[PDB]
Design goal:
It is classed as transcription. The entry lists the keywords DNA-dependent RNA polymerase V, transcription. The entry is titled "A cryo-EM structure of B. oleracea RNA polymerase V at 3.57 Angstrom". Chain A is DNA-dependent RNA polymerase IV and V subunit 2. Organism of A: Brassica oleracea. The structure is cut from a larger assembly and holds 1 copy of chain A (1008 residues), 1 copy of chain B (99 residues) and 2 copies of chain C. Chain A has 1008 residues and is of the alpha+beta class. Chain A has a domain of 158 residues: Dna-directed Rna Polymerase Ii 140kd Polypeptide, Chain: B, domain 3 (Alpha-Beta Complex), CATH 3.90.1110.10. Chain A is built from 21 helices and 44 strands. A 6-stranded mixed β-barrel of chain A has the order 31-41-32-40-39-44. In chain A, strands 21, 26, 27, 28 and 29 form a 5-stranded mixed β-sheet that branches. Chain A has a 5-stranded antiparallel β-sheet with strand order 30-33-38-37-34, with no helix packed on it. In chain A, a hairpin with a 2-residue loop joins strand 8 and strand 9. The longest helix of chain A is centred in the middle third of the chain and has 24 residues. In chain B, 0% of the residues lie in helices and 19% in strands. Chain B has no helices and 6 strands. In chain B, the strands form 2 sheets. Chain B has a 3-stranded antiparallel β-sheet with strand order 1-2-3, with no helix packed on it. In chain B, strand 2 and strand 3 form a beta hairpin. Chain B is rod-shaped. The two termini of chain B are 49 Å apart. Chain C has a two-stranded antiparallel sheet. The longest helix of chain C has 19 residues. Chain C starts with a helix and ends in a 6-residue tail after the last helix. Classes of the chains: A alpha+beta (1008), B mainly beta (99), C mainly alpha (97). Chains in contact: A-B, A-C, A-D, B-D. Strand 4 of chain B pairs antiparallel with strand 1 of chain D. The structure holds zinc ion (ZN) (3 copies). One zinc ion binds next to loops of chain B. The site of one zinc ion (ZN) has 7 residues of chain B, from loops.
Chain lengths: 1008, 99, 97, 194
């Protein structure tokens, strides 16, 4: 089987199709949103609250004895956190709470958090209710739909999935915040826990997002520039102040002598500039302190951490602070070696042997989804809650009054209002500076298509840092291959900053269950506990930017690690990175990389030997035929472009991609012939025109009370097929109808990108839409302040037009509301009208009346009007190729050119549109669909005569011209695509042959 | 300049010369230890740096049928003063001819 | 038909038709001065994607294919950075007139 | 930088000397194109030894001898002599201490450009002394008391030796010979029809 032929291409392409459809069966398309929110609820919520023990020193007074410091210093600490499923907390048997209740009643679909606090303040250091505090209300957190907390997920398909809150098209990765549908956008951050090499002052850097006391080593600063000084290394600012030279921090950590610190760095030898730099470093070192003499003669110069600091890092500023550098390292004999490694990296970057860190290369980037953002916001508002609480505990010095420890001091409304303003306002906390705000986060959720929701749920965003040489921050970088999309993007204020996650892209979540001990079983000798210098030229194995060991012959070691991962013995979300030049191995167990699956070229190919008729995706990840691969790991892999012929030409490949059209986004991958069009046209189609086309809306329109719902009558699917539309099996990814298009000059009405339809086709229902708009009002509870009562009524004294209103204040359910009437009777008892009225351009038949309310009685009213529109002489349409127009002339049927079968076109466009705009994909699509839908003669004998029919216009793997033209020759038509017509006015033969054939067109919103 | 180290303290050596015998000797600064030197160079730098010539495009070459032959000023061993020569930037040329 | 829909003389729309019957041409250079030199150097490096594994003929930035016969994914990406740069250039600024 | 360019036309034909035009094109560049010392160097070696007996000065003011080695092929390529380097270095170091600068380099030596010093290069380079010119000394601190604090003062005049010009005008930033095609496709001219 080592040839890998004899199980050839119809087997392998079938396997790729089955694997891709099983992929979408297991994961779906909103998988990352749900995984990050679920991870937050399962682990990170309890992980946030473990902060401290809440001491309280109560500094008020000391003149007298009865106001000494004799009242007890308190103590209290958090325990478990318990989160309910969301309920509607009414008295008299509280009720279960659903997202459609939240939308129609204008409330927040939120759940209650209860914390198991313990308090054991007890008078024994003067010169208890750990129990009865099991359930303390601490804020209300909102709940994602389809989460592990939403009540619409416990039943799979037909137990009770039909509840009253569902659509068959909805998959639900959104929120509901006071009646509105919110959605996070994925942010983009730098990958910390990695060394970062600048070059303007040469300042190699050990970042840490937590532990805001962490340092950089800078070599390109001389402190003066008079004649010139040699570049010497100063370990610059270390505790947000306090520069030190490098050698004081060597002999503070207990280096024995020199020539081991030169072997700790261990540069090339020679390259005078390096050794001149280090001897200048020593000569700068002894000029500021006489070091290396005692255990305190060098360590005593680490002295600026005491007073010359401006910010003394805690109490006991001594060797206790030596667990503020490098906490992942455990003793000083490794911290000295890691300092030597940092300096070796800096010296290797100076001589042009290691390239500096390119920021816009996406292996240096971690994407923050909803979990980390909720982490950040909740930490901010919890810290404010802790301060507000401890200021409240201190007001009861030396006299109790109200001492019940809980429910008198811990206010839930603080965290409640905080998390509400975070979603509603957009005032999102900055990831670095803990006082300011950022904005380009949670937005609204579009509903015009069911494709606009998919596009709106899969987006990632680079922020604007400063417009002085952003660099390549809006241009596709070769690390986007297979992960983000390199064709579709917005244009305008944020062109290229908001990027679309691809089809087969996935986002890693976290890896728990620590794996330091798991690496020993393939190599991985352990790191020593002394300088000495026994370290050879053996390779280095880092774990999240941390020395945990050293191995040799790594070409076998990473092979064995990948072999343990493919046998489901190491976790699946772990990248194995073998850097052969820098002599280094990196292992990632990180939260927020970008993963995608690939075919592993096995040497046995179990698919031949077994052949079941089913393949679950959990099953194919056990046999190691597929494999989740990140960006780091992929550049060590030579991957073919498909089983088509390309994995059969050679065997120099170690992987294969499933199919090449999965490089694109969710909306760009379904466009026929998409690599034939100019890139600007595909950007148009896949960012704006697909998001605007009129088509499917929902499968339960009785509950969606929103402004301007729209829908066609007869939606369709295209005649052709693409790969992604077949593996997804959503016909809601196509919103338009299969028009027949002929390119010909009309009388002058289709000039300047204008189109001409057929009136007979318009009268049989084609492109007939239907819109529904909703009108809303509100009034206080019933009688309370918690006259200006504008209670919904009639007010019979004939203010405006009241021909259709009933006594309740609202019309009836069959009315024919006119150009300008009264639509809601919101009038008071005696004063003038506050009633809502129609403006100049809204009218239509009443569909339903919905009357809901809020907790404080705030009664809500909803009236929906319905209209039916046929497309008028000012409306806009478009093809699948960014070729849009305006309907300018509606023509009667018997004047069109007709073929010998009597076929008439439905849309006629101008042939001056094609040689300039460079879209031959529309002509190829028309010829393909015309070759599909026609019959096939000579069917008697020798064949079933309908089996060699091409229906696949997959983008990067498309049928040739000879296939299409020989299909049109088989179907009976002319090979050039044309067709002879006769005129509808003179009736004789038009001299020029006309190009006809079906095309999927679209109808766009903002009609006029 | 290779670094040198002390045999007692293993710190870096500092070059230091007393003119009693006209001799160079490396000294340590840590304890008191001194010894006699071997080399000569106290310092070594190798400072750094470890086409923008005019081209024409209307003259015949020898091998390739191109117009280009980059011309720069030279003074060869059989030449005199200011002389020009013509070798095409194509590596097929390889030949240097006089006018 | 092609003699009669296009103005033969104009340079503006006579290369557009060679971009869809002939070949595209030079999609990448370092003189299209909005994307930096680093993008050019690692797009030149990224020609390891079956272009060094199979070939060294042609060059990065040169597309031997046309719109009508289709673009295989590398030169599609190169054409995307070119069209993206034209969008950024003709989109930004423009308040100087 | 638009305020600094000057285009120069050169049309003195002679009619039939056949490449007198292109010889006219480049010699006027040669009088103006700037070359320096810092570009043709390779290394820099100060050394107390090897000139202990060459130090003949009665009070022994002379101990350190900083070589600045060149590369031969660029010094032999552009027809740059070695004695004119001595000329242009000595008069510059005189005419800049005559300028009110300091009294740090008043006793500069600037000995001779020899093209073969000695079998040098203890630290590994392994060449055979090809233009090791400008083997100066710096006896300004007469009877040098401290060896190391005097070596740094032999590294405050190595830059001003590097930054000198050899052949060409000091004021010229560049000069370029270009554009053998005066037709209407290029920039604005004063005449070219001919
Ligand atoms: Zn010593
Ligand atoms: Zn030749
Ligand atoms: Zn020399």
């Amino acid at each position: 089987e080592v040839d890998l032929r004899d199980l050839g291409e119809p087997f392998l392409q079938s396997f790729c199709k089955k694997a891709a459809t099983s992929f979408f069966d297991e994961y779906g398309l909103v998988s990352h949103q749900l995984n990050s929110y679920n991870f937050f609820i399962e682990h990170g919520l309890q992980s946030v609250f473990e902060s401290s023990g809440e001491m309280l020193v109560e500094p008020s007074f000391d003149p007298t004895k009865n106001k000494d410091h004799e009242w007890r210093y308190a103590t209290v600490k958090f325990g478990e956190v318990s989160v309910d499923k969301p309920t509607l907390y009414s008295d008299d048997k509280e009720l279960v709470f659903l997202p459609w209740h939240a939308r129609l009643q204008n409330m927040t679909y939120s759940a209650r958090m209860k914390v198991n606090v313990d308090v054991e303040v007890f008078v024994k250091k003067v010169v208890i209710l750990s129990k009865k505090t099991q359930d303390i209300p601490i804020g209300r957190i909102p709940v994602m739909v389809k989460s592990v907390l939403c009540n619409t997920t416990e039943k799979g398909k037909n137990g009770e999935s039909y509840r009253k809150g569902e659509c068959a098209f909805d998959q639900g990765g959104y929120f509901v915040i006071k009646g509105a549908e919110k959605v996070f956008i994925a942010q983009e951050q730098i990958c910390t826990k990695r060394l970062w090499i600048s070059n303007s002052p040469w300042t190699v850097s050990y970042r840490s997002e937590t532990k805001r006391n962490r340092f950089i080593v800078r070599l390109s600063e001389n402190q003066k520039a008079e004649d010139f000084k040699r570049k010497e290394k100063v370990l610059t600012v270390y505790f947000l102040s306090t520069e030190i030279p490098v050698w004081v921090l060597f002999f503070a950590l207990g280096v024995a002598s020199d020539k081991e610190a030169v072997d700790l760095i261990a540069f090339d030898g020679g390259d005078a500039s390096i050794t001149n730099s280090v001897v200048a470093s020593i000569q700068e070192a002894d000029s500021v302190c006489e070091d290396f003499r005692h255990g305190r003669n060098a360590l005593a110069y680490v002295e600026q951490q005491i007073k010359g600091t401006k910010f003394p890092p805690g109490e006991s500023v001594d060797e206790c602070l030596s667990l503020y550098l490098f906490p992942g390292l455990k003793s000083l004999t490794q911290k000295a070696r890691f300092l030597g490694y940092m300096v070796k990296c800096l010296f290797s970057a100076y001589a042009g042997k290691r390239k500096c860190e390119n920021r816009d290369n996406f292996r240096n980037k971690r994407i923050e989804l909803a979990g980390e953002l909720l982490e950040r916001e909740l930490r901010v508002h919890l810290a404010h809650a802790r301060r507000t609480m401890t200021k409240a505990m201190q007001r009861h010095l030396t006299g109790d009054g109200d001492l019940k420890p809980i429910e008198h001091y811990l206010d839930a409304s603080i965290i409640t209002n905080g998390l509400s303003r975070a979603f509603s306002t957009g005032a999102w906390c900055h990831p670095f500076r803990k006082m300011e705000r950022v904005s380009g986060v949670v937005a609204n959720l579009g509903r015009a298509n069911p494709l606009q929701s998919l596009i709106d749920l899969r987006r990632t965003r680079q922020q604007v840092l400063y417009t002085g040489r952003v660099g390549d921050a809006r241009y596709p970088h070769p690390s986007h291959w297979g992960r983000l999309c390199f064709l579709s993007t917005p244009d305008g204020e944020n062109c290229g900053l908001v990027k679309n996650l691809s089809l087969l892209g996935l986002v890693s979540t976290q890896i728990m269950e620590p794996v330091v001990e798991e690496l020993f079983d393939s190599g991985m000798e352990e790191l020593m506990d002394d300088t000495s210098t026994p370290l050879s030229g053996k390779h280095k194995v880092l774990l999240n930017g941390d020395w945990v060991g050293v191995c040799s012959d790594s070409d076998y070691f990473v092979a064995d690690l990948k072999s343990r991962r493919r046998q489901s013995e190491l976790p699946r979300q772990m990248e194995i990175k073998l850097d052969k030049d820098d002599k280094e191995v990196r292992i990632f167990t990180d939260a927020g990389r970008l993963l995608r699956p690939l075919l592993v070229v096995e040497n046995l190919h179990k698919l031949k030997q077994s052949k079941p008729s089913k393949y679950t995706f959990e099953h194919l990840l056990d046999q190691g035929i597929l494999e989740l691969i990140g960006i780091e790991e992929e550049e060590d892999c030579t991957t073919a472009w498909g089983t088509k012929q390309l994995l059969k030409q050679q065997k120099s490949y170690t992987h294969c991609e499933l199919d090449l059209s999965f490089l694109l986004g969710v909306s760009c991958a379904i466009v026929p012939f998409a690599n034939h069009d100019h890139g600007r046209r595909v950007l148009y189609q896949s960012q704006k025109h697909c998001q605007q086309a009129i088509g499917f809306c929902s499968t339960n329109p009785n509950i969606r009370c929103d402004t301007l719902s729209q829908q066609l009558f007869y939606p369709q699917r295209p005649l052709f097929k693409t790969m992604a539309s077949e593996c997804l099996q959503k016909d809601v990814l196509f919103n338009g109808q299969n028009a027949i298009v002929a390119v010909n000059v009309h009388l002058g009405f289709n000039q300047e990108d204008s189109i001409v339809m057929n009136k007979a086709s318009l009268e049989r229902g084609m492109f007939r839409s239907e819109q529904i708009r909703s009108y809303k009002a509100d009034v206080d509870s019933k009688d309370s302040e918690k006259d200006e009562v504008v209670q919904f009524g009639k007010t019979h004294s004939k203010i405006g037009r009241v021909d259709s209103l009933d006594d309740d204040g609202f019309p009836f359910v069959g009315a024919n509301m006119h150009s300008g009437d009264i639509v809601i009777g919101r009038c008071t008892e005696s004063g003038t009208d506050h009633s809502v009225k129609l403006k100049h351009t809204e009218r239509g038949i009443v569909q339903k009346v919905v009357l809901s309310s809020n907790d404080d009685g705030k009664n809500y009213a909803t009236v929906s009007l319905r209209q039916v529109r046929s497309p008028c002489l000012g409306d806009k349409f478009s093809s699948m190729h960014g070729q849009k127009g305006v309907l300018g002339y509606i023509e009667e049927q018997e004047n069109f050119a007709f073929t010998n079968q009597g076929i008439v076109p439905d849309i006629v466009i101008n042939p001056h549109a094609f040689p300039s705009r460079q879209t031959p994909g529309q002509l190829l699509e028309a010829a393909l669909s015309k070759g599909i839908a026609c019959p096939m003669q000579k069917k008697k004998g020798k064949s079933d005569a309908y089996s060699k029919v091409t229906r696949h216009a997959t983008p990067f793997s498309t049928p040739s011209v000879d296939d299409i033209t020989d299909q049109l020759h088989r179907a009976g038509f002319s090979r050039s695509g044309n067709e002879r017509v006769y005129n509808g006015r003179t009736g004789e033969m038009m001299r020029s042959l006309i190009f006809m054939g079906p095309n999927f067109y679209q109808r766009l919103i903002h009609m006029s | 300049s290779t670094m040198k180290f002390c045999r007692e303290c293993n710190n870096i050596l500092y070059p230091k010369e007393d003119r009693e015998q006209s001799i160079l000797l490396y000294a340590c600064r840590n304890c008191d230890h001194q010894e006699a030197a071997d080399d000569n160079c106290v310092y070594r730098n190798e400072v750094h740096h470890s086409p923008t010539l005019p081209r024409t495009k209307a003259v015949r070459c020898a091998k390739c049928q191109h117009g280009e032959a980059v011309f720069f000023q030279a003074t060869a061993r059989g030449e005199e003063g200011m002389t020009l020569f013509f070798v095409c930037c194509n590596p097929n040329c390889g030949h240097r001819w006089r006018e | 038909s092609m003699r009669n829909l296009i103005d033969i003389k104009s340079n503006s729309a006579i290369n557009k038709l060679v971009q869809q019957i002939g070949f595209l041409g030079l999609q990448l250079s370092d003189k299209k001065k909005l994307y930096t030199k680093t993008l050019v150097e690692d797009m030149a490096q990224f020609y390891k994607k079956k272009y060094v594994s199979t070939s060294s003929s042609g060059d990065f930035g040169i597309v031997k294919g046309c719109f009508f016969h289709g673009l295989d994914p590398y030169e599609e990406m190169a054409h995307s950075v070119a069209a993206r740069e034209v969008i950024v250039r003709s989109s930004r600024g423009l308040a100087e007139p | 930088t638009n305020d600094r360019r000057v285009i120069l036309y050169l049309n003195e034909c002679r009619c039939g000397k056949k490449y007198c035009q292109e010889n006219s094109a480049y010699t006027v560049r040669n009088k103006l194109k700037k070359v320096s010392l810092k570009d043709t160097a390779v290394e820099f070696l100060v050394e107390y030894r090897k000139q202990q007996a060459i130090s003949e000065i009665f009070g022994m003011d002379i101990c350190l001898h900083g070589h600045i080695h060149l590369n031969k092929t660029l010094l032999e390529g552009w027809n740059i002599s070695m004695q004119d380097i001595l000329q242009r270095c000595e008069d510059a170091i005189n005419s800049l201490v005559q300028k009110k600068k300091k009294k740090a380099e008043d006793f500069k030596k600037m000995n001779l450009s020899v093209s073969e010093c000695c079998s040098f290069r203890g630290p590994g380079s392994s060449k055979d002394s090809d233009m090791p010119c400008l083997m100066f000394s710096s006896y300004n601190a007469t009877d040098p008391d401290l060896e190391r604090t005097l070596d740094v003062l032999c590294n405050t005049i190595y830059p001003v030796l590097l930054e000198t010009v050899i052949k060409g005008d000091p004021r010229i930033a560049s000069a370029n010979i270009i554009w053998n095609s005066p037709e209407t496709t290029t920039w604005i001219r004063s005449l070219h029809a001919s």
